[PDB]
Design a protein around this nucleic acid. Structure first.
Ligand SMILES: [Mg+2]
Ligand SMILES: [Mg+2]
Ligand SMILES: [Mg+2]
Ligand SMILES: [Mg+2]
Ligand SMILES: [Mg+2]
Ligand SMILES: [Mg+2]
Ligand SMILES: [Mg+2]
Ligand SMILES: [Mg+2]
Ligand SMILES: [Mg+2]
Ligand SMILES: [Mg+2]
Ligand SMILES: [Mg+2]
Ligand SMILES: [Mg+2]
Ligand SMILES: [Mg+2]
Ligand SMILES: [Mg+2]
Lengths: 202, 397, 152
RNA sequence: GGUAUCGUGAGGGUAGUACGAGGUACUCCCAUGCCGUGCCUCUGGUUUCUGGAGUUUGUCGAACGGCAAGUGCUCCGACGCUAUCGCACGGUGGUUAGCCAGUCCCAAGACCAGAUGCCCA
RNA sequence: CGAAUCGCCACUUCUCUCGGCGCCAAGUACCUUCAUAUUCACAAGA
RNA sequence: GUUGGUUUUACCCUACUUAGCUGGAAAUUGCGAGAAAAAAAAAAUUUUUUAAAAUUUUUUUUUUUUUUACUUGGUACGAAAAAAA
RNA sequence: GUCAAAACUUAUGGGCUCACGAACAAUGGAUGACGCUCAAGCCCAAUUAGUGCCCAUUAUUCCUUUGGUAAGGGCGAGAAAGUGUAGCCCUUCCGAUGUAGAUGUGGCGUGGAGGUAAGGACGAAGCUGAUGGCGUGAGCCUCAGAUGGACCAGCCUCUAGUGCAGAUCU
RNA sequence: GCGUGAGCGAAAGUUUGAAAAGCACUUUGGAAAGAGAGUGACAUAGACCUGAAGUCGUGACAAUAAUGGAAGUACCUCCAUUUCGCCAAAACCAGCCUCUACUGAGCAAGAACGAGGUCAUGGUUUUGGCGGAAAUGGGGUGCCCCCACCCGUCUUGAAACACGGACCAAG
């Protein structure tokens, strides 16, 4: 059994727009599973954004940092904090919605090969940034800010890709069959249907 | 204004959650190296001093004998009893699994109990009967495939042999188990060292060698709810002070309107974990039965033993292999102190120095002890009344 | 009388000690331990707690009471060993096994079913404090009542 | 589900510093100061081992042995505690001295589907 | 233990810059069961 | 200008400092189901090896008990027999 | 844009902008937060595009109340010539906040009295109350006591030592 | 009772019951007391009418800054009423609301047809659902979302780091 999760693929999405759209859907009950939070982008040079983060990291309770604001450095933990800042995080409605979100760096093997991955066109980088303006890929800035697993994830991302690609041509004979099988299906007994398929573009 | 009283990176100053002094971080793996173990549990015995000829260009002591204190650390061989693999994850290392040795010394299985001898003593009983079966042999076989595949870290699970320690004061009979990382070559190389070594003893002399340094980690000696003057080193107040002298007079200000984590306060001092660095190994020492003339240096030929005349106070004879390393070691006598391979660069002119001892000391600790030898004490006093009241009895028999 | 009537009059023994002159707070603790216990294991807990072999788990009337390792038995760190209150409890449990015996009931099958130490009317006495003051001292004697059915 | 064991390490803490001499004007050395983390072999201090001795007055009839003097007092005194008054130690990598990471310290309320042992009426 | 949930799939479930099917006959031939569950009412079914 | 001239209370709350205990993943509830898991098994993606014969019996393998190498007292492999798969 | 209702980030609008930007030196930290950068910024204009939406104790409208020393009609159970009640009935209209303060009240409630009417050992007062019911409300009433044990509510008139969270009140 | 004194100066209802009939006797306890038994109409009338609050103990139960408001919902209701009517849904009518002209393609511009919505609008039933229970209402407890600065006070200004404020009863 799996619940109606939708695994948003967060690569090359604007951090705060994707965080804003996702933060809304969690309220509307969607059980999202962000992945590739390493790949979230931010406007500006990395230096703009490291300094923004290092001004964040600069904030701690002097009395006892131990209980102070916590400066998570995982791009995913950074995306969860970004997305909990956009939902009623103290009411249970929002504390609940935040637990319905599961960020991951990369795309983890439990979440791969589970179903198609969604995308947020309103949060696409090309949709948002002016293309020639500089941009900060998120897992890249946070590598410089303390995240230690930036290369662990890239080694993993390399593996799922080389693996997914091997399976994409393991199945090339198969997909090629249905393409051929389906094209010759039109030639089959579906006669009057062949005209109802021509209309509508099938 | 003066500097702060105390290091804030050693904080909270709380009781350690263990006592075995487990290594916090092993020195970084170097593939170029051949595989080796990175640490070794040892029991602090006591201290002595040694004479040595420093031969260090520069200083006023080059070519001159210097008396270094040394800690003696009895080191009965540890036994490997299982391998452990770690796989790197974006969230951090996960154990892949462990392969336990086909057999386990009871001292080890004592460790899984609070009352072994009133227990059914079933620990590793299913493993013993299952690792035997081909079903469980193939399962053990698969774990090693997972190591050779998914692992980044191979670690032996070794333990101390307290049975072999024969110390009368270290009351434990539960073995001191601990993973000991295998830095070395390729993971198959580490697995191979790991499994050939999977039920064998492991002497320190293999892990360490003389003049090389070792990081030590042991919980430091416990002092209970120590006061702020002993805990932090703050100045005690002038006699005329009312409420009491031994206090920080000002534990805060108006704002921030609360005591900060940085002001010193009474509480636990001692019995904290510590990793102290760069302790030179003045000698590995073989067990007294095997190599009786311990502490007999090239320049001090009398047959002798690393243990003082009264034995080590509170500990007694070092019946086993002993590491003898320069200076203090954290922890009370007879505490178990893990000591790893150095994590420092160790290319220092000092650290690389070969250490040829000129005189291990063996005088009594207890009193001043002006004799190096029980034979030499008798050679001073000669016969005395205990003997005449002994010698006479022998003649009558 | 009793806050709770026994389920089966013939099968239970009742016992009580009004204006018991032991501290309420200590007796409150001491009697509540017993509330579900079989009488023999409750005779026992007291004989053992009277030996400092086990403790009465103080629960509500902790206060800045000291930690003991004999309280692990009861799920908490604080525990305590009233003697004046443990003896009064044995002495009230003797009262019921006596009451239980006369009913033809068997005391060693009998189970404590209801313990209830109400706080009794208090006795005044006087302090004599610093600058000419006279604050109260007051004992807080307890009303303990209980019954103990045996299972049918 | 218990119990137990080994670990993970998000997060948080975080520290080394200065001076001098040498060597040749960087490197490289060698000491020290401060700081810090310990430790107690040595050396010093500490004695309620009132240990051993000496000793004063009272006292036990006396010697012996004590005893009282709130530890009578003086000498020596182990264990232990402790002193920069002794001693050992104080490590890197990446980015723009900083800074971050590490080493170092606490570390699952960071709820670790990490591993593992045992039993699961 | 009665539950809320109401598409699935190794044709999406790779990467980097109209996925297939399913929707009442395993199929385009309507063979063929459906009532009274009596015009909404949580789908009374998964 | 000079001189003399009672400095009280925490045992509360929080901060903090150590020190414990116990719960908890619908953060105590729902059964409201998401794993940084895997997607016949192991070894060198494909091939070969691991109960068989008519539920019970037989055979094989492993472990425990009895009669050299490990730091050297106590555990391992040796043997032989019995039990379990 | 999210928090946050609404542009599920609208425009089939214009410019400008790379680093800040969004009416009235010292505990770490504030466009409100996040975050935003072909803006989620600024100036301008817009409203589905050369063929808007969201939120008031506001407005309008509807229901109800109350007030009007406001406007009229009327006189199966009711129809009272009425300031005010459980309002004589119906209709329409306008008003409604409010400290100090003023006033009204067939307004509430208390001890007592003149009356009236009635109740009570088949249980008065008192007290208890997931006892409901009624009243805008002060409150009243009923139920139930596995409460009590002997007094007493209604109504009109009279009376007052008459209503209490707060006085460092006793 | 207080004060050397002059003087100050309480609290206290024996209101158990009709009557003492004031709990004999048994039983445990050293006792106090307890368990039975007995008296009485009642002893939760026991030396005591009533028997409040607050406080506490206990059982059971719901549960997880406080309180609080609004609205629901979950569960419970020793409550009320009603039904043997209650919940619904659709329709009809009314109401109500929404959705040419000029100009040189534009407006400063006017209706119409048609359709929709709606009872927290009025009147017309219809049709089904439910019926020891159902049903509406109330009450209780929890939750959810939302709203919500401790009151009294003097003061221009109080949530104030301004004063008074532990609880309750009688006054
Ligand atoms: Mg003073
Ligand atoms: Mg010594
Ligand atoms: Mg105390
Ligand atoms: Mg205490
Ligand atoms: Mg006096
Ligand atoms: Mg259904
Ligand atoms: Mg749970
Ligand atoms: Mg919105
Ligand atoms: Mg008004
Ligand atoms: Mg009066
Ligand atoms: Mg109530
Ligand atoms: Mg008055
Ligand atoms: Mg009474
Ligand atoms: Mg003023």
């Amino acid at each position: 059994h799996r619940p109606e999760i939708i695994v948003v693929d967060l690569k090359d999405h604007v951090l705060g727009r994707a965080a804003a759209i996702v933060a809304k859907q969690l309220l509307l009950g969607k059980k999202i599973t962000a992945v590739r939070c390493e790949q979230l982008t931010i406007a500006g040079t990395e230096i703009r954004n490291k300094i923004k983060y290092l001004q964040f990291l600069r904030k701690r309770k002097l009395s006892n940092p131990k209980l102070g604001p916590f400066h998570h450095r995982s791009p995913s933990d950074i995306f969860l904090r970004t997305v909990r800042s956009m939902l009623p995080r103290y009411t249970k409605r929002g504390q609940k919605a935040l637990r319905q979100l599961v960020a991951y760096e990369g795309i983890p093997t439990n979440v791969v090969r589970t179903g198609g991955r969604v995308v947020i066109p309103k949060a696409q980088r090309h949709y948002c940034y002016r293309s020639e303006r500089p941009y900060t890929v998120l897992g890249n800035m946070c590598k410089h800010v303390g995240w230690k697993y930036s290369d662990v994830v890239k080694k993993l991302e390399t593996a799922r890709v080389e693996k997914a690609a091997r399976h994409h041509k393991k199945t090339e004979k198969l997909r090629a069959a249905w393409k051929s099988a389906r094209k010759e299906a039109l030639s089959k007994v579906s006669k009057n249907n062949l005209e109802v398929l021509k209309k509508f573009g099938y | 204004e003066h500097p702060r009283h105390g290091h804030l990176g050693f904080l909270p100053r709380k009781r350690s959650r263990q006592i075995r002094g487990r290594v916090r971080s092993f020195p970084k793996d170097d593939p170029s190296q051949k595989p080796h173990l990175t640490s070794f549990m040892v029991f602090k015995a006591g201290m002595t001093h040694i004479v040595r000829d420093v031969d260090r260009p520069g200083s006023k002591v080059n070519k001159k004998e210097v008396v270094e204190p040394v800690t003696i650390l009895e080191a009965p061989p540890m036994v490997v009893v299982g391998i452990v693999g770690y796989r790197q994850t974006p969230v951090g290392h996960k154990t892949i699994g462990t392969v336990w040795a086909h057999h386990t010394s009871v001292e080890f299985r004592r460790r899984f109990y609070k009352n072994w001898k009133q227990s059914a003593q079933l620990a590793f009983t299913k493993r013993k009967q299952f690792a035997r079966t081909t079903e469980g042999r193939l399962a053990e076989a698969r774990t090693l495939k997972a190591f050779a595949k998914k692992a980044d870290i191979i670690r032996v699970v070794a333990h101390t042999q307290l049975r072999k320690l024969r110390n009368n004061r270290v009351g434990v009979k539960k073995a001191h188990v601990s993973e000991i990382q295998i830095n070395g070559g390729t993971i198959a190389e580490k697995i191979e060292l790991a499994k050939s070594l999977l039920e064998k003893e492991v002497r320190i002399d293999s892990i360490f060698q003389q003049s090389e340094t070792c990081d030590v980690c042991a919980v430091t000696k416990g002092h209970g709810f120590t006061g702020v003057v002993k805990r932090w080193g703050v100045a005690c107040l002038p006699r005329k002070t009312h409420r009491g002298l031994r206090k920080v007079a000002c534990i805060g200000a108006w704002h921030p309107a609360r005591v900060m984590y940085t002001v010193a306060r009474a509480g636990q001092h001692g019995y904290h974990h510590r990793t102290h660095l760069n302790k030179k190994i003045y000698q590995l020492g073989r067990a007294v039965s095997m190599e009786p003339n311990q502490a007999t240096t090239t320049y001090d030929l009398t047959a002798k033993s690393i243990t003082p005349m009264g034995g080590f106070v509170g500990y007694g004879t070092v019946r086993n292999d002993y590491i003898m390393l320069k200076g203090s070691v954290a922890g009370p006598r007879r505490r178990v102190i893990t000591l790893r391979r150095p994590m420092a660069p160790q290319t220092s002119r000092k650290l690389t120095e070969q250490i040829t001892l000129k005189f291990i000391d063996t005088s009594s600790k207890i009193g001043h002890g002006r004799f190096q030898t029980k034979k030499e004490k008798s050679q001073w006093f000669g016969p005395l009344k205990k003997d005449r009241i002994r010698r006479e009895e022998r003649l009558r028999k | 009388h009793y806050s709770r009537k026994p389920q089966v009059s013939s099968k239970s023994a009742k016992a009580k000690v009004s204006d018991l002159r032991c501290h309420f707070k200590n007796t409150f603790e001491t009697a509540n331990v017993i509330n579900g216990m079989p009488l023999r294991k409750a005779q026992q807990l007291y004989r053992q707690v009277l030996a400092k072999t086990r403790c009465i788990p103080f629960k509500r009337y902790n206060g800045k009471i000291g930690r003991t390792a004999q309280a692990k038995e009861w799920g908490q760190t604080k525990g305590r060993w009233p003697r004046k209150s443990v003896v009064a409890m044995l002495s009230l449990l003797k009262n019921a096994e006596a009451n239980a015996i006369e009913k033809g009931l068997d005391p060693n099958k009998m189970v404590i079913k209801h313990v209830q130490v109400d706080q009794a009317a208090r006795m005044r006495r006087r302090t004599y404090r610093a600058h000419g003051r006279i604050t109260p001292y007051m004992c807080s004697p307890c009303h303990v009542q209980l019954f103990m059915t045996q299972p049918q």
